[PDB]
Symmetry: D3
Amino acid sequence: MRLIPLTTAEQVGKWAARHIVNRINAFKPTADRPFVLGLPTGGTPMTTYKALVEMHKAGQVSFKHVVTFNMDEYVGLPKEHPESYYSFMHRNFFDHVDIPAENINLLNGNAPDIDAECRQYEEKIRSYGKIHLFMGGVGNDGHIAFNEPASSLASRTRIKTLTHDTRVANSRFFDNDVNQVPKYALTVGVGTLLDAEEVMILVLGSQKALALQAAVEGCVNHMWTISCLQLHPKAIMVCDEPSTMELKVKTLRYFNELEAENIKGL
Amino acid sequence: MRLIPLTTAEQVGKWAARHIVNRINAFKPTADRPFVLGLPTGGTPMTTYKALVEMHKAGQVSFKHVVTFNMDEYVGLPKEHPESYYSFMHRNFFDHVDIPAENINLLNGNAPDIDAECRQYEEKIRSYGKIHLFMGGVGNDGHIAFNEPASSLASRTRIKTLTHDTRVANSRFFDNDVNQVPKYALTVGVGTLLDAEEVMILVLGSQKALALQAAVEGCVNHMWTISCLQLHPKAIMVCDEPSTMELKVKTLRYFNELEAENIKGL
Amino acid sequence: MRLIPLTTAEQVGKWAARHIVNRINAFKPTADRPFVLGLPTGGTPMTTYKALVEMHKAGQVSFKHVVTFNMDEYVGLPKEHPESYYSFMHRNFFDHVDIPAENINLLNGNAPDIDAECRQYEEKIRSYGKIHLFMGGVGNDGHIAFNEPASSLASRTRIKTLTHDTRVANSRFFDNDVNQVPKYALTVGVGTLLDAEEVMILVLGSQKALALQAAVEGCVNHMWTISCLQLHPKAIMVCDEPSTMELKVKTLRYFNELEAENIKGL
Amino acid sequence: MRLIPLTTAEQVGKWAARHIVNRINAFKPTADRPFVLGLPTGGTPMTTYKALVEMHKAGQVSFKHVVTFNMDEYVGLPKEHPESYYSFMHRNFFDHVDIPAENINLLNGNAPDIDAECRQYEEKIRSYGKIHLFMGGVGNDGHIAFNEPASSLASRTRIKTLTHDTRVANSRFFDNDVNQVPKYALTVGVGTLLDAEEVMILVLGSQKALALQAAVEGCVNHMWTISCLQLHPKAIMVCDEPSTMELKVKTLRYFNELEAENIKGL
Amino acid sequence: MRLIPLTTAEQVGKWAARHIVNRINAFKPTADRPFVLGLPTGGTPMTTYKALVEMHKAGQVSFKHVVTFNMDEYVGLPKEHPESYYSFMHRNFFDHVDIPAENINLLNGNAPDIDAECRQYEEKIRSYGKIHLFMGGVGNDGHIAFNEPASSLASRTRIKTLTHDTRVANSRFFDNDVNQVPKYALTVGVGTLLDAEEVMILVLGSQKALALQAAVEGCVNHMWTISCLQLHPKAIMVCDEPSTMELKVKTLRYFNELEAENIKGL
Amino acid sequence: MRLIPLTTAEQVGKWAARHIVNRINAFKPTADRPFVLGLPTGGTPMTTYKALVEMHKAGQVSFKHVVTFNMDEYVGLPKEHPESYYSFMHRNFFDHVDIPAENINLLNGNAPDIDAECRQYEEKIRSYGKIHLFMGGVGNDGHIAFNEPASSLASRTRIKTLTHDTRVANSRFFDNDVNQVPKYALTVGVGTLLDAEEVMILVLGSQKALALQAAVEGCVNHMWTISCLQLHPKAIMVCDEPSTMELKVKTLRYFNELEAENIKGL
């Protein structure tokens, strides 16, 4: 696993965005061989979306041949509600870049048949073959996407009931009323994420310090589903300073030495 | 993972039996496409076998196109000894339902060549393709089938030496003399069980409370082989009230909310 | 998992060597179907190499149709430096047996393109199909090969930066100067090792007692990569007495009973 | 230890206030034998102070012969600054009850000699003999008063440097600027607290659930100094419902039935 | 702490009885300076009471100047009910030895004022000065006397509500009906026990193996109150072989060689 | 607890020596009121004894009115054997400073009555009243003095059987033959140490990192008796950089900023 120990969210955003641009440009996507990017929503990826839009406007990347898949979506929230993940993604990223609308894939939280919706989403990933880079955040309780505690480590896309803690955590966006947060979400599974060629998790803030310790020093278990990255051949966690507070001194020391050259953009 | 928190063994038996009937009836098995059911022995499945026989007699299920495989069998116990798993299964289930004798598969604990016996059992599962539902119990030390502590999580059907604790636990059936309990058993492996499409474990009594906590809140490890269910895409644990005593309040709360509608047969 | 609890390093070497000879002779390798042996270096395998050479000289085994692959090699150490793993393997084993030079495979720590070197090594294993037996040691921190803490459990052959602790541990061989120990090594991955048909780890001395406890009683986690053997269908750990000191009494008791007949060579 | 499992912060305040009134009235304080009460500041005691004020106003308790000692005070904050613990205490409690100024004892966080101040405070407690009841809250990381992680479990009143996390927690009272919270505070030690005749800790909110679990189910250690209550002969924890979420089902079951009658008062 | 690793309950009883006789005879009790012995009930002390009776009958010990205090008694069970600890003690011990009725002290679980009873018991111990040796057993969940999980480690004699699990354990003596076991008992506290000059705990059976591991290798905590013996200057645990199964190999190795000579007596 | 995070053993010795000199000089010892210093042997105190000798020689401290007590001594090693702790102490410290022979107190490991010797030592400490500062090291398994795993946390001076691992550790001083190290030593107990007014433990090297983590972040338990310092009101740990490697990042961050000024002295 690579862990990139940076100091601020701004640096995390810039390292992340640069890593995505380098993978796309090294890949050289065509219409016949698109780069497939998996994407998250939440407070965590904001500095990364800002930095990607900047680099696009500066002529560094084109999303013309990138296909995107998002991680999750709330069940039963109107698509045009400002906090649906559909609105989030348009507002913060899609409106500003040159990705064709036919290249955007998002789960429909208001689908009449949830099983059919989830199944077709998996089929759409499979027609492209694979997701080349899946970017995500981590929940306070260790969830990757909305794969809540006790989600199978071989799970596929399905509906999940959100933990009371996740709803309280997300009430931020619904003007602090937990009763306004949707109770369910459609989410890619842990197995779906492990199938991506590379997974990059952004970890920001002291609220994520126990989840980062579980991911890096804990054992594989379905209560902290972020621990599934121990089983992935190419996982990267990009961290700010408050989130590393629960790690052992020798673990942070190792990653600091490892990554010294690769984090000195400056 | 789904966990069904019920109160009594009677309710567990009824939920389990109903779930098996619903899968068979939804499946609509034919002679050319049988439903394949994996089965356990022990004190745990008794209320489930009682409830399945009742439902069969009431015309709810036919086992005419169901093929069964049992989990394990004692090595060196005469087939007609009342406590062989062969006798257990006939006495408590097979004698009462309409399953063809050619549809019953049981390991032969007195086979002259144990490796050949175990290999042919795996081959017989493979000729059907897969086990659609494997029902099991859990040992006090966390074993699934007789995959004792330190059994590989990728193990296949083989002979295993029983732990002294399992023999003491099973001496119940051999009029409390541990010296009468067989020392070895033939057992499907953890890998064999993980290949089933769905796994349903019944957990009854406070003696199983530490094994349930290991399964649900512990990490994946081969000392409690029940923890392998964290890696299975479709595992269900059906519990009575004494077995949930070692779980965290928030874990039981989550599953209680999740399952409220599905446990109110009433 | 099988654990062979012996008393001395000499006995471990003799049990190990005999197990390798029995597998080769049962296999009956030909030029068209060679036996493929994965091998380690370090203080741990010395009594095993001594005992294999003895048995070869006594006419018990021929390595004429055995292909070998070594686990790892230091980056940037001259091939003829007495402590390169290349020199180790020639000095202690290859010089004394009848293995054809074309049958020996070792990583080139001075390759100009490290990625290409690592990729071709994996391709060379794949042209033979599989490694039939991979023998290894375990590091004080639980590493298998140089898959240091936080190495993916699905990793392939790649370059790794050695932990300060491993360098201090290995400074033994570089006349106690840590500054002379190479900082990097080329190593087969955890996924590479899990693909071998059988894995046999030799554990010697009280310095390995915490690594053995992590392997046998701990959970699967990438900080102690030796825990990956819990996921392997055919793993054997051969231990001396000081290394078992951190195990529970009931764990050692079980393995002692299990293995009584198979350890009484005498 | 007694743990009183209640649902709401309002119920916790009512229970706690009723217990203080019952102890005072059973004691029958006079000018020669005052009841000595230790008190906290923070969000946690607010519903208790409101309920106590209501009881005093209704004629149920008088504080004319109660002597109070507060746990702590910020160093270098002016007395009349609204967030000094002096201002907190008068605004929220002393301004509304009949306690004489003579009976109020607060640490002077702007004393010329801090060392003299702490020693005199201990002397003051000793002159009355004993604190009969010490009420406190618990920090998110288990600190009781400002005895931060790694404070001695036998410490006395002293100056203490606050953990960065506590400053973040308390920044709410300093318009969310961590730079506004004092870095140092005068505080009673853990030994000072353990000398009290009875200790009642109020635990409210999900943010306190890991500290509650450490206090009830963890071991005694100086990283969660709330664990010191395991060594106290008369300790009470009064809890709302979100703070009990990390306890085991059997722990909360046990306290629920011990206190059933005791909380039915409503 | 001393731990005496023996094989059988008969050997434990002989060792323990011999140690009591040696302490009494070395003390040389008289009418003015009695030896004060604290005693348990339950299955565990049976082989010790038998061996002590045999030693008294052979003329090796007299109890004419021994004062005894029992650990506990059921509340609300009539004195002459066969399972009252009063009846247990007379049947199994006092009926066969020469102790005067004056010297026997038992808690009266049917006293008018339970609070008066507990305080008088403590006073009675104080009038003799000190308990010279307190013998006890340990519960499956680590309770020493009836100081159930979460009892203060500084508690005194008081009434206590029994855990449901203890009622299940003791239902053996009430023809296996849990509804027959008293819910409340009078018991010496942990502080009462720690005030004894020497404490000897008898540990028998596999059911006690986790409690033994908590006492020897765990941390001090009030959930396993047997852990309080880590704080006692003269504590002894006398164990049979199944109760040591959860200890580490090195822990039992250490005690085996310290006590080798000391147990060779046979 | 205070922890002084330094880099090098030379800095640890300078810090520790300076602290001893400051305490002595602030105390102003005289013939009637001596300063009483407790002292260790072993590799750990070497840079401290060198620095103290340099300070004495420069006229900064006199030991004419310092009384010393050493922690321990080997049983059955002749006094003048070079590795007796008597010889160690004179060679490395007393031969170079002005302490009168009258003021030196060492356990006599060749006394006729070992039991008399230990009790007299305790009496000797009591005649001076109190040890003002006890300096010690910590063993690899957390033993403080020779209070090996499972020594009482309230023990007094006594004879003790050494763990095999401690004999292996100390075999360095006996030309690496374990058979040369004494099996038994006289040692001050944990209670003896906790009675000292201040305790300063020097922690040096990577071999001490797990013991340091147990002392700072673990729970109090008698298997790592260094954990007893959590109960001491004035304990100091002076550490070099490799011994802090197993602590959490936030623990070392906290002590680094508390002691920043305090270690800038250089």
